[PDB]
Amino acid sequence: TLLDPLANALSHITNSERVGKKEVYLKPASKLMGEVLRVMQENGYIGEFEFIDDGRAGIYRVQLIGKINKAGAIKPRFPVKAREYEAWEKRFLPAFEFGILIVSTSQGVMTHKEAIEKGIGGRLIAYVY
Amino acid sequence: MKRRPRKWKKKGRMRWKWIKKRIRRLKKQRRKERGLI
Amino acid sequence: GKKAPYGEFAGRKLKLKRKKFRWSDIRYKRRVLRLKEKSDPLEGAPQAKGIVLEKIAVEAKQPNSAMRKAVRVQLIKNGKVVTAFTPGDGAINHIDEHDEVIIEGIGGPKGGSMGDIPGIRYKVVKVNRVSLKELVKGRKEKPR
Amino acid sequence: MARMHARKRGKSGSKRPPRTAPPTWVEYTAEEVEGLVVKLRKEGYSAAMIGTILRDQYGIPSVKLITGKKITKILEENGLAPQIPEDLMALIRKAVNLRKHLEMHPKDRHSMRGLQLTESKIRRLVKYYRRTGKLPAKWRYDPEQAKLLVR
Amino acid sequence: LPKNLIPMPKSRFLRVKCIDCGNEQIVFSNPSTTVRCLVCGATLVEPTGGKGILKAKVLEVLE
RNA sequence: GCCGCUAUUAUUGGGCCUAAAGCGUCCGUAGCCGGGCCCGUAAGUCCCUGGCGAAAUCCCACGGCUCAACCGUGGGGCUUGCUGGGGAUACUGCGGGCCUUGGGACCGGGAGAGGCCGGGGGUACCCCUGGGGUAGGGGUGAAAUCCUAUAAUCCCAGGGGGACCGCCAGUGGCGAAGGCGCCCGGCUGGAACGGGUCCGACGGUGAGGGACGAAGGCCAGGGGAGCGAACCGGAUUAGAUACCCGGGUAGUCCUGGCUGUAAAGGAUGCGGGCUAGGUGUCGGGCGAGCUUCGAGCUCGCCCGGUGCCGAAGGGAAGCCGUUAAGCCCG
Ligand SMILES: [Mg+2]
Ligand SMILES: [Mg+2]
Ligand SMILES: [Mg+2]
Ligand SMILES: [Mg+2]
Ligand SMILES: [Mg+2]
Ligand SMILES: [Zn+2]
Numbered sequence: 001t002l003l004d005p006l007a008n009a010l011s012h013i014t015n016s017e018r019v020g021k022k023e024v025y026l027k028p029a030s031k032l033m034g035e036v037l038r039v040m041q042e043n044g045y046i047g048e049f050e051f052i053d054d055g056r057a058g059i060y061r062v063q064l065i066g067k068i069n070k071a072g073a074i075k076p077r078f079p080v081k082a083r084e085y086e087a088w089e090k091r092f093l094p095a096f097e098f099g100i101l102i103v104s105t106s107q108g109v110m111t112h113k114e115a116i117e118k119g120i121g122g123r124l125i126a127y128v129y
Numbered sequence: 130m131k132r133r134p135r136k137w138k139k140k141g142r143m144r145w146k147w148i149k150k151r152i153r154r155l156k157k158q159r160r161k162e163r164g165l166i
Numbered sequence: 167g168k169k170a171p172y173g174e175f176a177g178r179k180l181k182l183k184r185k186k187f188r189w190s191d192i193r194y195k196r197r198v199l200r201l202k203e204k205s206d207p208l209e210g211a212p213q214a215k216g217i218v219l220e221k222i223a224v225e226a227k228q229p230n231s232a233m234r235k236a237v238r239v240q241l242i243k244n245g246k247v248v249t250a251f252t253p254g255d256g257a258i259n260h261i262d263e264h265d266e267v268i269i270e271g272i273g274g275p276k277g278g279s280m281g282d283i284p285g286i287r288y289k290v291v292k293v294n295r296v297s298l299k300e301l302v303k304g305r306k307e308k309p310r
Numbered sequence: 311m312a313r314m315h316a317r318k319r320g321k322s323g324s325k326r327p328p329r330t331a332p333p334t335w336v337e338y339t340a341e342e343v344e345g346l347v348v349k350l351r352k353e354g355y356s357a358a359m360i361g362t363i364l365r366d367q368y369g370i371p372s373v374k375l376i377t378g379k380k381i382t383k384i385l386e387e388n389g390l391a392p393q394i395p396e397d398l399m400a401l402i403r404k405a406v407n408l409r410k411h412l413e414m415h416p417k418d419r420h421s422m423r424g425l426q427l428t429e430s431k432i433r434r435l436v437k438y439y440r441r442t443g444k445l446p447a448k449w450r451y452d453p454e455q456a457k458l459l460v461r
Numbered sequence: 462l463p464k465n466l467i468p469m470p471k472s473r474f475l476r477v478k479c480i481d482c483g484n485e486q487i488v489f490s491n492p493s494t495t496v497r498c499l500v501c502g503a504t505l506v507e508p509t510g511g512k513g514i515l516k517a518k519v520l521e522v523l524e
Numbered sequence: 525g526c527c528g529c530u531a532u533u534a535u536u537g538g539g540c541c542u543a544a545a546g547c548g549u550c551c552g553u554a555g556c557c558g559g560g561c562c563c564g565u566a567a568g569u570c571c572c573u574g575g576c577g578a579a580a581u582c583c584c585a586c587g588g589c590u591c592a593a594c595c596g597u598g599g600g601g602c603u604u605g606c607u608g609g610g611g612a613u614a615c616u617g618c619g620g621g622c623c624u625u626g627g628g629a630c631c632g633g634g635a636g637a638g639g640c641c642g643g644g645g646g647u648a649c650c651c652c653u654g655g656g657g658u659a660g661g662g663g664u665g666a667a668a669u670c671c672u673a674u675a676a677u678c679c680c681a682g683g684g685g686g687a688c689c690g691c692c693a694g695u696g697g698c699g700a701a702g703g704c705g706c707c708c709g710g711c712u713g714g715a716a717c718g719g720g721u722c723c724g725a726c727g728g729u730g731a732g733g734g735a736c737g738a739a740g741g742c743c744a745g746g747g748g749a750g751c752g753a754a755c756c757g758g759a760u761u762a763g764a765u766a767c768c769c770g771g772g773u774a775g776u777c778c779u780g781g782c783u784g785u786a787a788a789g790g791a792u793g794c795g796g797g798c799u800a801g802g803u804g805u806c807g808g809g810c811g812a813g814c815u816u817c818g819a820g821c822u823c824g825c826c827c828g829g830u831g832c833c834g835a836a837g838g839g840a841a842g843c844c845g846u847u848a849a850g851c852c853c854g
Contacts, residue, residue, distance in 0.1 A: 001559085001627085001728050001795055001854085002795095002796055003557060003795095004557095004853055005559075005560090007853050009797090011851060012797075012852090014851070015850090019799060019800085019837095025466065027625085027797090028559065028626095028797095030560070030561095052466070054328045054625085055327070055329065055624075057560045057623090059467075075854090076535090079568090079570075082571080091536070106569085106612040107614080115570095119571070121569085121570050123614080123615050125614090125615070134791080135544085167546095167794080168852085168853070168854060169538095170556095176555090176557085184533065190533080193532090312714080313627065313727095313728095313795080316700085317794080318715060318828075319829095320716060320827085321717095321828070322827075324470075324721075325470045325719090326720050327467075327470060327720065356722075357630095357722050359630070359631070359721075359722085360721080360722085361721040362632095362719085362721045362722085365492075365719085366492035366721095369474050369476075369486070371474065375720080395723070398629090401628090411640085414641085414711075415640045415641065417639085418711085419640090420639040420713055420736095421711090423713075423735080424714065426735070431629095433552085434552095437726085471718095471810075472718085474720080491719060492719090493633095508631090510632070510634055510808065510809065511810070
């Protein structure tokens with residue numbers, strides 16, 4: 001059944017970007033979907049996201065800007081020390097600082113770059129390039 | 130039996146129904162000469 | 167569907183299935199059950215020594231026409247008869263009966279038969295402690 | 311939601327609108343709404359039927375919106391909530407009636423399958439309600455004990 | 462944005478009055494039960510597969 | 525011989541319509557995967573630090589044998605790691621609490637060859653009886669076997685029998701699949717729609733395990749019209765252990781059991797989300813219009829089924845294409 005709203009959201013973004021849609025709606029919203037979108041906005045992959053509120057888990061309206069090739073969840077949320085991001089980059093991204101691996105840490109949800117400059121690891125949950 | 134559609138084809142083969150029937154006759158003879166005679 | 171166990175805590179069942187289908191791998195099976203060692207008359211060796219019992223000839227498959235010379239050879243380590251092909255042109259004449267002969271593999275794909283020789287797996291290499299190549303090219307005459 | 315043994319993607323259902331506050335057109339207060347709930351349970355209606363009647367007759371949408379509480383919460387407060395839960399009870403009544411049918415009709419294997427699926431649902435809910443305490447841990451479905459239960 | 466975002470009811474609650482007593486009463490448009498007047502016992506809406514058929518609403522409102 | 529080649533073992537990273545490959549279908553145990561919010565814990569996880577994980581071996585620099593290999597000095601790594609503390613708390617887990625979208629229950633009016641049981645019928649076919657009427661009928665490519673002069677075929681009036689339910693009947697419907705078609709009544713299953721109804725994550729998949737499961741076959745007991753394996757005859761043919769013809773046993777039907785196989789096929793496992801639509805059709809609902817005022821007709825919309833087509837896309841291609849063989853989550 002439903003499992004990982006985050007993966008579903010990312011796949012939706014990916015498919016909508018392939019077909020040139022300007023806005024997507026992510027229906028089983030989460031604080032994690034929101035943090036991931038915060039990061040994607042900050043690194044300039046999407047435009048503007050707003051939380052719509054129903055009586056249910058809430059929706060996210062997400063305005064895109066044509067800067068995504070592949071966005072996806074690393075679903076075995078892989079533990080990663082502060083000195084293995086090289087390898088996980090090589091697995092998930094095409095060039096050396098091209099995209100963004102999103103990492104959940106004890107100090108929040110971050111990019112692997114910020115994690116590196118903080119010297120903290122965590123768990124990988126998504127990639128975006 | 131476990132069967133194979135590949136075997137059911139006929140390009141260079143005899144018909145599988147009849148291959149099967151032959152196999153079963155042999156098996157019957159063997160079973161027959163094994164347990165009681 | 168998406169493949170079997172992909173979960174973070176599913177390594178057990180994952181390992182299990184990979185093992186299950188390695189057993190469908192036939193190379194792994196032969197290596198691990200040691201089937202070659204059980205069915206090999208050379209007993210896991212690259213060469214072997216044998217006594218020539220008889221000299222024979224073998225017809226090439228279908229399109230080729232020739233009588234490939236060979237010898238039936240009794241191997242000493244086990245007393246087992248195998249047939250070996252004598253490369254060269256007058257090799258079968260340089261070879262005689264009751265002669266000690268060394269037995270290599272003929273090459274061939276799966277340690278097996280080679281070319282238009284249907285069912286011969288072995289080569290003759292030495293004859294009474296002398297290479298058949300040299301005997302054939304004339305040098306190094308035979309002791310006995 | 312034929313899902314669970316039929317796998318049809320049925321979508322029939324209710325569409326509650328997002329409501330942080332009750333509607334202003336509503337006449338009744340929480341107290342008299344509770345009184346109506348209790349009245350109808352004494353009339354012998356299940357909680358589902360109570361909500362249905364309060365929706366259709368009295369124009370009460372979402373007793374939860376009004377009172378802040380659920381119908382079964384109100385019933386257990388006034389000492390009227392059912393011993394075993396209603397959905398389980400309903401399934402058990404179905405199963406008993408079907409047992410009777412199937413004793414007089416042994417060759418109705420399709421209805422026998424319906425019974426099997428009904429009892430599967432029973433077992434699922436029993437597992438969940440044992441886990442949550444709404445039944446004792448030692449509770450277990452049995453056809454004859456369930457017959458005595460219904461009766 | 463339309464017709465699946467925030468799935469909203471098509472049904473309405475609507476105020477009606479009986480022809481016999483004349484008491485205004487709120488009801489539901491898609492009832493599962495025959496709705497009766499709280500005072501007279503008169504059927505105000507008869508149930509169907511969907512939108513109930515309305516008796517006794519000659520002065521009506523809908524919310 | 526081992527590694528590589530080999531993404532021919534695939535965690536990275538393979539495939540299962542037609543090439544090897546989706547259990548016949550369902551149910552469910554363990555296992556694995558699991559909606560959203562709040563609080564806590566801090567087990568996994570991350571950081572920092574203490575103690576260990578011998579030396580040799582590996583990498584690097586620098587030195588000594590002419591350089592090198594070799595050796596030494598030092599730095600690092602290696603050993604699957606284990607452990608003592610301290611800190612963080614996003615994710616997972618554990619505990620508690622709230623929710624309602626997923627699922628379950630309920631209600632309502634409908635639909636449907638879903639199933640079981642009873643009753644009532646419909647032709648047709650076969651036999652018997654009686655009447656008529658005489659010389660052939662039947663069958664084939666052509667013939668014959670066979671039936672018939674004890675009266676056949678044909679026609680007519682009666683009786684009996686067993687099976688089976690035509691046309692309507694459809695890319696139709698119901699069902700997990702197998703499969704299910706005369707009508708009427710009774711018992712019963714499941715689904716869709718409508719639903720500001722209830723419960724409140726109860727869910728998915730399912731090793732093992734269980735249930736159902738076409739025809740056929742077997743045990744026992746009944747029945748036996750038609751058809752009819754085996755068999756028996758007539759032909760055909762070079763032959764004809766067959767195809768054609770005439771008969772005919774089991775069987776086909778019923779009861780109760782076993783068997784548990786099929787091109788059991790959508791040759792496509794199940795669930796969930798996303799990615800243009802068009803046009804039909806079934807069911808329910810809504811809104812309009814028309815009406816012979818009909819459980820009626822037409823148009824549109826929503827949901828759910830079932831089909832065709834189809835851009836993008838996919839694919840070895842055929843073909844698939846929101847009922848994916850596409851992307852993602854199991
Ligand atoms: Mg292979
Ligand atoms: Mg392959
Ligand atoms: Mg195949
Ligand atoms: Mg060491
Ligand atoms: Mg097409
Ligand atoms: Zn009134």
